[PDB]
């Protein structure tokens, strides 16, 4: 009768606690709500996007405010290499005096947290210097979030609600997002870099009160409009330049040096400015491709129809894909998440090797935390992309309009795809595990010379093709007579070769047999997770065991014990099973990154080169060895600032085991137990006076799987984050 799940009549009429759980867990599945129209669906999605933007901007404004109010941003800027950043103050009434004095770091007057997000380095690089600058930024972002909230409320009003056709205008949206959202934003950012960040890094102080007075270049906009742009690169910064100080500074605003700043071990600000200018030009050009209102452009549908091979190997090609993609929000979500996961992996892989922020390479814990953060985010995003592809096939795929096109051909030979993924996973797993066990047994028997150590010569050849002279292949920028070397020796190679031939940084680290084995483990993880996800996506509509799986939806428990048993037969269950494998794969990736960088930072890379070829080395020289300071955070003899990370380590272990509980015992035990407890409560005096309204029931099968998965993932993340931070900050090395 219009209870809490007002969007679902069936849940509202459920007299159990299942109503509450499923109303909480099915709120954002707008397409499943009762009396849902596509117009209302699109408008609700638009307003929810506005709300998310407001939330993101509030989060960043709160970061700014807390750093401005409780941080040491000015003290850190005066002395970055010997000041620990402060995240925020701590007011825990449960602390004792030893905890109060253990957490007083960073020159604070009380317990504080030490930031590991890199916001200090990032804000110092972009020109922010004082706490008033950060406060102004926080207030501005509060205003921006308020504006987005106002917009989200406004476009839901009757006279400003957009129509469905407006939401399906793909060409105009692409044009505007490529030109303005991507291109003009990058143009504005390079304008900031030219006007504020670079002068700040060269000792000048440019703010709003002198933006029109401060001259970014002595020859302002003359050579720009005369075509002689080289004037903006005549006087680059010297190698004796000190960041933020006029000593050794130059006058060029758009250089092309490449490599790293010698004192900050980061990319040059002028190189990044020229980067953003170039990509802004490219994006603004690219955003003029499609046809909106002026008779010029492209018709994306006609592009898709035109692209069909005449030989018929692809069938009808891409005919009907425009309508399939524009009519299905799940296809768009899957594509967006795929691209976003790839780009997040790219960000993680490029910021550790090419640090863009000053004094960020020296902050080892910050680098490790950032890498692990973005890699886990990327993995989750990829799982989401595949899950939404499965949801597209179940709910949005029409075989009538998609007849013999590429999607239908994928569905046709899906058995071949899944079988070849199975073969690749099996081969990789068998041989990598066998080599690891061989090495383990050889070290166990005292004969390390009998190991199967395969040199990663392909990646080393690529490194040599990038300018690495350590392996002596002498080709493609490793040789003086190569045409690529001659072409590049004038522009970036003086910096790039110097940076890549420096082994003190993380630019193309030296690799060996352990690197070979772990990259093959990574390939195994990627291939197996993709196998599970693609199998779920392509068997989502049906299979031999359940030919009518599409009528049962995306997430259903099972089809009963008939036909041999049908546990985890849904595509949602494929996602459930692939979350474990992605967690494992990102765990391997981060374990490798972290160990490689611990042995690099400490200066003893021989430990990794000798111990990473067998798994006992991984257990002992990485996990057991680096957890000594972690587990001593609090002990019978006292406690220190790592006590919080020890407590979180144990906390993550506990949540992991509780996830095990929800994943092993399935439903019936708890339903019978709850029956018994209901009897007990109804028969107990002084307590049968208190009565429940929702009949207590055991958790459902899908809900049990999801709760166990959430516990497992939370324990995974917290345990590894605690270990990572404690072992990288207990020894700053």
């Amino acid at each position: 009768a219009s209870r809490f799940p007002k969007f679902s009549r069936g849940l509202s009429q459920d007299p159990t606690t299942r109503r509450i759980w499923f109303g909480i867990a099915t709120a954002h599945d707008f397409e499943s709500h009762d009396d849902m129209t596509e117009e209302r669906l699109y408008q609700k999605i638009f307003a929810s996007h506005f709300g998310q933007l407001a939330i993101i901007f509030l989060w960043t404004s709160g970061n700014l405010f807390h750093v401005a109010w409780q941080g040491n941003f000015e003290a850190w800027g005066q002395d970055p290499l010997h000041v620990r950043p402060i995240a925020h103050a701590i007011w825990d009434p449960h602390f004792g005096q030893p905890a109060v004095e253990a957490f007083t770091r960073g020159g604070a007057s009380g317990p504080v947290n030490i930031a590991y997000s890199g916001v200090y380095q990032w804000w110092y690089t972009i020109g922010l210097r004082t706490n008033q600058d950060l406060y102004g930024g926080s207030i501005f972002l509060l205003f921006v979030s308020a504006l987005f909230l106002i917009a989200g409320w406004l476009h839901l009003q009757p006279k400003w609600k957009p129509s469905v056709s407006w939401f399906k205008n793909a060409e105009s949206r692409l044009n505007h997002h490529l030109s303005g959202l991507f291109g003009v934003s990058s143009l504005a950012w390079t304008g900031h870099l030219v006007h504020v960040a670079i002068p700040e890094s060269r000792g000048e102080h440019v703010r709003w009160n002198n933006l029109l007075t401060a001259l970014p270049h002595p020859q302002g906009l003359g050579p720009f409009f005369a075509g002689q742009w080289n004037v903006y690169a005549q006087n680059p910064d010297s190698n004796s330049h000190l960041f933020g100080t006029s000593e050794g500074a130059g006058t060029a605003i758009l250089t092309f040096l490449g490599g790293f700043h010698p004192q900050t071990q980061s990319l040059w600000l002028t190189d990044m400015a020229h980067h953003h200018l170039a990509i802004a030009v490219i994006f603004i050009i690219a955003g003029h491709m499609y046809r909106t209102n002026f008779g010029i452009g492209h018709s994306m549908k006609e592009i898709l129809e035109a692209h069909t091979p005449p030989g018929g190997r692809l069938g009808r090609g891409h005919k009907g894909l425009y309508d399939t993609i524009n009519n299905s929000l799940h296809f768009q979500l899957g594509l967006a998440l795929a691209s976003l996961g790839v780009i997040t992996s790219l960000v993680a892989q490029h910021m550790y090797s090419l640090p863009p922020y000053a004094f960020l390479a020296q902050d080892f814990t910050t680098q490790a935390a950032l890498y692990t953060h973005h890699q886990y985010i990327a993995g989750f995003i990829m799982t989401g992309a595949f899950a939404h592809g499965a949801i597209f096939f179940i709910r949005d795929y029409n075989p009538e309009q998609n007849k013999d096109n590429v999607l239908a051909r994928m569905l046709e030979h899906k058995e071949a795809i899944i079988s070849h993924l199975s073969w690749a996973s099996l081969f990789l797993g068998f041989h990598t595990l066998g080599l690891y066990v061989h090495n383990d047994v050889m070290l166990a028997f005292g004969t390390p010379e009998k190991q199967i150590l395969i040199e990663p010569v392909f990646a080393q050849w690529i490194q040599s093709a990038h300018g690495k002279a350590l392996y002596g292949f002498d080709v493609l920028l490793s040789s003086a007579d190569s045409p690529a070397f001659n072409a590049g020796q004038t522009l970036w190679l003086p910096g790039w070769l110097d940076a890549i031939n420096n082994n003190s940084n993380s630019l193309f680290l030296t690799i060996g047999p352990g690197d070979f084995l772990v990259h093959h483990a990574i390939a195994l993880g990627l291939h197996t997770t993709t196998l599970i996800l693609v199998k779920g996506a392509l068997d989502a509509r049906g299979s031999k065991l359940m030919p009518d799986k599409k009528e049962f939806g995306y997430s259903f428990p099972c089809d009963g014990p008939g036909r041999g048993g049908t546990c985890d037969i849904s595509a949602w269950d494929a996602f459930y099973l692939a979350v474990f494998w992605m967690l494992n794969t990102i765990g391997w990736v981060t374990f490798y990154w972290h160990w490689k960088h611990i042995t690099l930072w400490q200066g003893n890379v021989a430990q990794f080169n000798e111990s990473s070829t067998y798994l006992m080395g991984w257990l002992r020289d990485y996990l057991w060895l680096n957890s000594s300071q972690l587990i001593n955070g609090y002990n019978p003899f006292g406690m220190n600032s790592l006590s919080v990370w020890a407590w979180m380590f144990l906390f993550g272990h506990l949540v992991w085991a509780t996830g095990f509980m929800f994943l092993i015992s399935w439903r019936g035990y708890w339903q019978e137990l709850i029956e018994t407890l209901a009897w007990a409560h109804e028969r107990t005096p002084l307590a049968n006076l208190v009565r429940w309204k929702d009949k207590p029931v055991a958790l459902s099968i899908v809900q049990a799987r999801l709760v166990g998965l959430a516990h497992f993932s939370v324990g995974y993340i917290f345990t590894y984050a605690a270990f990572l931070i404690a072992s990288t900050s207990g020894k700053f090395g």
Binding site: D34, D35, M36, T37, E38, I394, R395, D396, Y397, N398, P399, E400, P547, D548, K550, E551, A678, W679, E682, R691
Partner: protein, 142 residues
């Protein structure tokens, strides 16, 4: 077929009590009542757990769920060869005859029975969910 009425003078089986029985649901929502005729005093197993002696004649047993009524009735039919019928009883005194709606057990085909839920096509000839997008109906409902 005229459904029988639920007599209130039918003795219950000899049972010593159990923790598996009627609860607050029986007094706020509904319960069930199964009746059967027995030729002799014999021991049967209660569906809620335990043993009881059925009367040599009419019997009357209160249950909390329909599934327990079917379990006891199936055991009675396949073991003691006893005809049974049960009713759904509401707190307001409403009694609904349930199991032999037409006097004949559902396993035997009987004339006058209407086909409910019967689809005139193969299971694999269902419409795709995509064609029924934004329509508040299911593929199997067509």
């Amino acid at each position: 077929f005229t459904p029988p009425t639920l007599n209130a003078d039918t003795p219950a089986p000899i049972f010593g009590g159990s923790t598996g029985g009627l609860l607050r649901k029986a007094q706020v929502e509904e319960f069930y009542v199964i009746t059967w005729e027995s030729p002799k005093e014999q021991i049967f197993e209660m569906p809620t757990g335990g043993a009881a002696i059925m009367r040599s004649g009419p019997n009357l047993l209160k249950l909390a769920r329909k599934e327990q009524c079917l379990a006891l009735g199936a055991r009675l039919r396949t073991k003691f060869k006893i005809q049974y019928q049960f009713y759904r009883v509401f707190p307001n005194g409403e009694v609904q005859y349930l199991h032999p709606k037409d006097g004949v057990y559902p396993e035997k085909v009987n004339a006058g029975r209407t086909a409910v839920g019967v689809n005139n096509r193969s299971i694999g000839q269902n419409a795709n969910p995509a064609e029924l997008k934004f329509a508040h109906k299911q593929a199997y409902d067509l």
